[PDB]
Design a protein around this ligand. Structure first.
Ligand code: FE
Ligand code: FE
Ligand code: FE
Ligand code: FE
Lengths: 200, 233, 233, 200, 233, 200, 200
C-alpha cells in the first residue's frame, strides 16, 4: 500500500501546560497579546455566553490542571480563522482549570450551525480539545447545548454515537451566573457517565 | 472565514500513544474506558485558527530575552512543519514551554527544589515562515522528577504545541533531545508503542544552524497530518 | 613517607589520545614533535600524595552549596575508582571543575556570553571512601563553543582530576554524558582514535542512585592504571 | 593475550583548569585548604628555593594557561605523601602560568635524591606534569637543576635520552630573585629546544 | 529499635508480573485498578523483622522428616538470596511449601485424587545463613491440575517466601523445575511478561549439589531489591 | 544506563499459603514457634488493642485465603525488629483469613509516632502487606487510627495521596470487642473503596 | 544530528591552471574578456595603488604557478560584486605568478573600511585566495596596509589572531614603483612567517 510520512506522535500536555498556553491562569506575567478565554468582545455579535465546567477523572475527582481549546463558529456558523485580538470575535480560544479555580470559564458567543461534508447540519457545538496531564493524546469532544435538543437529535455526529445514554454526556446544562447565560459542561474522562470523545 | 477544502489523513492511533498506558499513572484515571467514536471530517475539524496577525512581541520566540540573561545552554530550536505529503505548513503557530535549565517551571505548583531563574520565563511562540520554518532561541531545559513511579524522571523536553492548518492537525507534543537516556524509560514516552514513532520526537542536533560562538541548534521537524484535497466526495 | 611497592600497567597510548590531533588546533603547537621518552617506573612515578588529611570543607563535594542554589540539573556524579584489575581505589582525590549550566566558567577569560551563576562556582573535590566510591552533587554543565573550527562545540563535560595512588595514575579527563550527540563531533573527544575508549568517558545514567524527587545520578567509574605488586624485579 | 580493564582515557585540562585546580591563580575565592605552590613553610628543613619558568608553544609564544603539578621529595629525599597544610613540607604542589603571570613560581626546597627501582640514584628532580589546553594527555617532564651537573650526568633517567642536546632541556637555570635562590625552568612544548617528555 | 538508614532500589514493576494477567484467572478480581501511590521510603518501609531469634525446630527445613519416608523423587532445593547489587542477604527468613509427589497438598482444601502421603507434610522454613544460602530437602512435587483452564496443570513447583531486610524487600515466589514442559504453558508463569524474567524462576538441575544414590538437587537463587545508603538527603 | 540484577519475580502465594505460613490457620499441626497474630503480651506498655478486618476482592467477596503481614512501631514509636515470642511486644505479625475464619485478628498496642525521612512526624500507623492466590505481587498499605485525626492531618504520607478520599481508606475505625479497645481495618483490593496500596 | 549533502571535494588546480584561468599569463591566445589584475581604471577614486607580491612554498621557493584571486572593497569601503570590464573599479581580480613573471601585480585602489558582523570596523584589507598545484584546497588570507596602524590595532579580525606576531604577516608594506604608491604583500604558505590563513 502507499504509506506517507507518519505524523509526529502526540504527548500529554503535562502539569504545566498553563505556563505555556495559559499565562495568566498560571499567574505569570502575560504578553501583550494572549490567546485566552474571551472569544468575544462585548461588542461581538451573537448571544454572549459564559461556559463553565469541571473535569473529572475516573475516580470522580476534579481535574485542576486541564487545558482546553475550543473552536467554534461565530454566530453565523462561520469559522473565523484569522485570529486577531482586535477582532470582536475569535473562533478560537483557550481556557483552563487550575488549583485556584477548578472550573474553567469561557466568554463567547453561541456558535452557529455548520454542515458536515455531506451537507447535513450539525447542532451548534463547540469543538473542544482537552489536554492535561494523564492524557496522551488530546481528547476531542464537542459541547452541545441542552437548549438545542432539537438540533441535537439530528446531528449526524451525535447520531453516530450508538447509545443514547452516551450522547448525553455531550450536552451542556444551561444555568445563569450573575445574571448571565451560562452552560455547565462537565467532562468525565472515565467511568460512570464518561464523556464521548471522538476520532477524526 | 475558513473553508472545507481539505481532508486530513486519518490518524494512526496505533502510532500515537494509546489512552491507557498504566505505567503512566495519571493515565489510568484519565483515560476513557469507552472506544472513541469515529467521525467523518467536516469543516469543524478541517479548519483552525490562522495566527498570522497575532502581535508577536519582538522577543516572543526568544526566550533569552523575553522574561539579565538566563542561565543554561543557549540553543536555537528550529525546523519545519510539513504535512504527511511533505508539503510545508507556512504561517503556523508553534508554541513552546519548558522548564529552566534546572527543570523548574515558573509555576506555583512546581515545588521542585531546583530554583527559579530570575531571567527565565520559559515560554515562546513563533509563526512558521513561508516555508514552514520556525525557530526559537532558548536554553535547554533540564529533566525533572515526578511523582509517578517512585523514581520517575522526565527526559528534558520542550513542550510543543502546533496549530497547523486545522484543529485536526493540532498537536501537542514534546520534543526530546537526541541521545537523552531518559527517553526509553519514560512512561510518558513509552506511552508510544512503536519505537519508530518515538524517533519522530527526538530533535536532532543541527550544527548547520548553530551560531558559532553563541548557540547550538536543534532541528525538530514536525509532521502534521497530510492534507489533501477532497476528491470524489 | 611513601614507598615504591607498586607497578602500574603501562599506558596504552593508542588508547589515550595522541598529542597531535590537528583537528584540535591548539594541539598543533602544543604537541611535542619528538617521541616521548619511555622510562621505567620508580618511586618518583609510583607514589603520590595521599589526601586523607586535607581538611575538606563540609560541602567540598557539594557544588550545590559550596559557592541561593545554583540553577541547573541537580545530579550526583558518583562512581568508583578502580584500577585495571578491578580493585577499588580508596581515599583518593577526586577534583572536578566544570561550567555552569550554561557553559560558562567562573574564570576571567571566559567571555562566553552565557552568564555566570551567582550561586555556582563549579569546583568540587571528594575523597573516595573505603570502597573507592566518590560522589559529587552538582549541576549538569552545558556545552560551550570554542575557537577551534569555526563551529566547534564541546559536549557537556566535567573535568576530572584523579589522583590515584601515584603520579602515574593521576589523570585528568573529562566525563561526558551518555547520549550527548556532540560527543562524536568533538575534535577533543576525537583525539581518542578508538571508539571503545571514547565509551569509557561516557557517564551512564544511574537511576539506582538518583534521589527520587531530588536529583539524577550519573555513574562514572574510573579505571586507573592497574596497580600490581612488583614481582621478580 | 590477557587484557585487563582499559584505563580511562585522558583528555586535555582545557583552558579553565585554574578554577578547578588553581583557585587563587584563577582569582577566585579559595577554600580553607588549597594545594598550592608553597611546598615548604619557612621553617621546613632544606634550602628554600624559588622555581619559576615560562612555557612556550611550538611557535615560541608563551603558554599563559598551563597548570603544573609537581611531585618531589623533601630535603631528605623522602616522599611525603600524607598531604597536610600543617606540615612544614608537602611533596606535592601545584602552580600555574596565567595571563597575569606568564611565569609560574613555586616555593619549595630543593629535593633530596631518591633511587630508581633498581636502586640507582636519580638526580634531584622535580617531577612535573604539565597540563594545559592543547595537551591531550599530560606531559611528564622532570626539572633538574643546573647546579647539579654531576648528579645529572648519572641520572638513569636523563640517560635514557639518546641525544645529549635534548637532556639540556631539562635543566633549570639558577638565578636569584630578591636575593633568593631561584631557578628558571622554561618548557618548550614543541620545536627548537623542545623539552623532553617521558612515558612511564 | 530499627533505624532509617537504607533505601531500596525501586522495583521494576515491568519485570515482575503485573497485577492483572488474565490467563491466570484469580488475578482478575484480586488486582488493584488504581495505581500504586509511590511514597518515599521512611523508617516504616525501610525496616522489617529480623527472624534471627525465632525458635526453629530441627527438621523445619527437611520435609522428608518434618511431618515412614515420603514416596517421590528425593531432592534438595538450595540457592542464595542476594540483592540487586549482588549483595547477600543473611539471616533472612525463607519459608516454602509444596505438594507431594503426586501433586497433593496437605491442606483440607486439596481434594486431588492423588493420595496424601502419610509421611509428607510439605512445609519448611529456613533462615539464610551469613552468605545468604538456604536449603531444603523434600520430594519433587508433582504437577497438579488446577481449575484455571480446563486442562491446566501447574508445572511442578515449590512456593517460596523471603523476608529480606525490610518489608520493602519481602517477596513470595514460586520455583519451577528445569525443562518441565509444563512451564511455557502455565498461566501463572506467564504472568511474567519477559521470558527473561521467567527464566529467573526456573530452578536448574544441579548435579553438583545432588547426593549420589540418594537425591537430586535443584538450584534456585533469589534476588531481592538492592539496598543502598541514603545520600544527600 | 546502569542496570542491576533484576529482582526475582514475584509469584502469587497460591491457595495453600497457609500450609506454609499459617499452619494453625491451616489446621495442621504447628511447630513450636510460629509467627502469628499476637504482637503484644498482656503486660506490654501502650494501649492494648485488637485489630481485625476482612479482605475483599473486586467482586466484594471475602478473600478467605489471604495472608497478611504487619509491621508497626511499639507504643513509644519505635520499631522492634528483633522478633521473639518472649517479647512483650513484637513489631511484626501475621494473620490470615481462612475458610474457617474470614476475619483476621491481631492483638497489639497502638503504635507511637515516627518521623519521615525529612523529620516530619507521621501519624501512628501499621504497615501491612497482603498476599493471596490471585495476587501476583503482594500489596502494601498502611493502617492509620481514627482517634488520631490531628496527627493524621499532617502526616507527610497520608498527604501524598492526592485525593483526601483515598486517604480515608487507610484509617482504621476504633471499636470494642468484648469490651476491649479494637480497630477495624478492612481491605478492598479492587474496586470501590479500593484501598490505597503503595509502592516504595 | 542533521547531515546535509556534502560539499564537492576540492582538488588542486594543478599545473595548468593558467590555461584555464590566466590565459595571457599562459601565453595562449586570450579571449575578448578576461578577468585579470587591473581592478582600477585610472580614473577610479581612491588612492591608486599597485599591489605586488610573491608566493613562497614551504621551502622558501617561489611559486610560479599560482593563481590568486582577490576581493576588496573600493575606496569607500564598498564591495563591488558586479564584475565588469568597464567599471572603473572591480572588487575582484585575478593575478598569478608564472614562470615568466613570478610576482603578481594588481592595480587597484586602497580599500576603505568595512565593519565586521558585530559592527566593529575592520582595518582596510584585501581578501585573497590562493590556488596552485600542491594545494588541495585553496588558502584564504587578508592583506592589510602598514600605513594604517591605528586601524589595524583595533581590527576585530586581526585581533583574533592570538599572537601579535602573526598579525603582522598580514600587513602589506608601502613602497613606490615608478613613483607610484605600491604595497608589497608576500605570502608564505608554510613555514617561517607563514601567513595567517583563515577558515571561515
Ligand atoms: Fe514538562
Ligand atoms: Fe571545559
Ligand atoms: Fe502450589
Ligand atoms: Fe590536469
Amino acid at each position: 500500500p502507499i504509506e506517507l510520512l507518519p505524523e509526529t506522535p502526540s504527548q500529554t500536555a503535562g502539569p504545566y501546560v498553563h505556563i505555556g498556553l495559559a499565562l495568566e491562569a498560571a499567574g505569570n506575567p502575560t504578553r501583550d497579546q494572549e490567546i485566552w478565554n474571551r472569544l468575544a468582545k462585548p461588542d461581538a455579535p451573537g448571544e454572549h455566553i459564559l461556559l463553565l465546567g469541571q473535569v473529572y477523572d475516573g475516580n470522580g475527582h476534579l481535574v485542576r490542571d486541564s487545558f482546553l481549546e475550543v473552536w467554534q463558529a461565530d454566530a453565523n456558523g462561520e469559522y473565523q480563522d484569522a485570529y486577531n485580538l482586535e477582532n470582536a470575535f475569535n473562533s478560537f480560544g483557550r481556557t483552563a482549570t487550575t488549583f485556584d479555580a477548578g472550573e474553567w470559564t469561557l466568554h463567547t458567543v453561541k456558535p452557529g450551525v455548520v454542515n458536515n461534508a455531506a451537507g447535513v447540519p450539525m447542532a451548534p457545538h463547540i469543538n473542544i480539545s482537552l489536554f492535561a496531564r494523564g492524557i496522551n493524546i488530546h481528547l476531542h469532544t464537542r459541547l452541545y447545548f441542552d437548549d438545542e435538543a432539537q438540533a441535537n437529535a439530528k446531528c449526524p455526529v451525535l447520531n453516530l454515537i450508538e447509545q443514547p445514554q452516551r450522547r448525553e454526556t455531550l450536552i451542556a446544562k444551561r444555568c445563569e451566573v450573575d445574571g448571565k447565560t451560562a452552560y455547565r459542561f462537565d467532562i468525565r474522562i472515565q467511568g460512570e457517565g464518561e464523556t464521548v470523545f471522538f476520532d477524526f | 472565514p475558513a473553508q472545507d477544502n481539505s481532508r486530513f489523513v486519518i490518524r494512526d492511533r496505533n502510532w500515537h500513544p494509546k489512552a491507557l498506558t498504566p505505567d503512566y499513572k495519571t493515565s489510568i484515571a484519565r483515560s476513557p474506558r469507552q472506544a472513541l467514536v469515529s467521525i467523518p471530517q467536516s469543516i469543524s475539524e478541517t479548519t483552525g485558527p490562522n495566527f498570522s496577525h497575532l502581535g508577536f512581541g519582538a522577543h516572543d520566540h526568544d526566550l533569552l530575552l523575553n522574561f539579565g540573561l538566563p542561565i543554561g545552554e543557549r540553543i536555537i530550536v528550529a525546523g519545519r512543519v510539513v504535512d504527511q505529503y511533505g508539503k510545508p505548513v507556512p504561517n503556523t503557530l508553534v508554541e513552546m514551554w519548558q522548564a529552566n535549565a534546572g527543570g523548574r517551571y515558573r509555576h506555583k505548583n512546581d515545588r521542585y527544589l531546583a530554583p527559579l531563574d530570575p531571567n527565565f520565563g520559559g515560554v515562546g511562540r513563533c509563526l512558521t515562515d513561508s516555508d514552514g520554518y520556525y525557530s526559537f532561541r532558548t536554553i535547554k531545559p533540564g529533566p525533572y522528577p515526578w511523582r509517578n513511579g517512585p523514581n520517575d524522571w522526565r527526559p528534558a523536553h520542550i513542550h510543543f504545541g502546533i496549530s497547523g492548518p486545522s484543529i485536526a492537525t493540532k498537536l501537542i507534543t514534546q520534543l526530546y533531545f537526541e541521545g537523552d537516556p531518559l527517553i526509553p524509560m519514560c512512561p510518558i514516552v513509552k506511552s508510544i508503542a512503536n519505537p519508530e514513532a518515538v524517533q519522530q520526537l527526538i530533535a536532532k542536533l543541527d550544527m548547520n544552524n548553530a551560531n558559532p560562538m553563541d548557540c547550538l541548534a536543534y532541528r525538530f521537524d514536525i509532521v502534521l497530518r497530510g492534507q489533501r484535497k477532497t476528491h470524489f466526495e
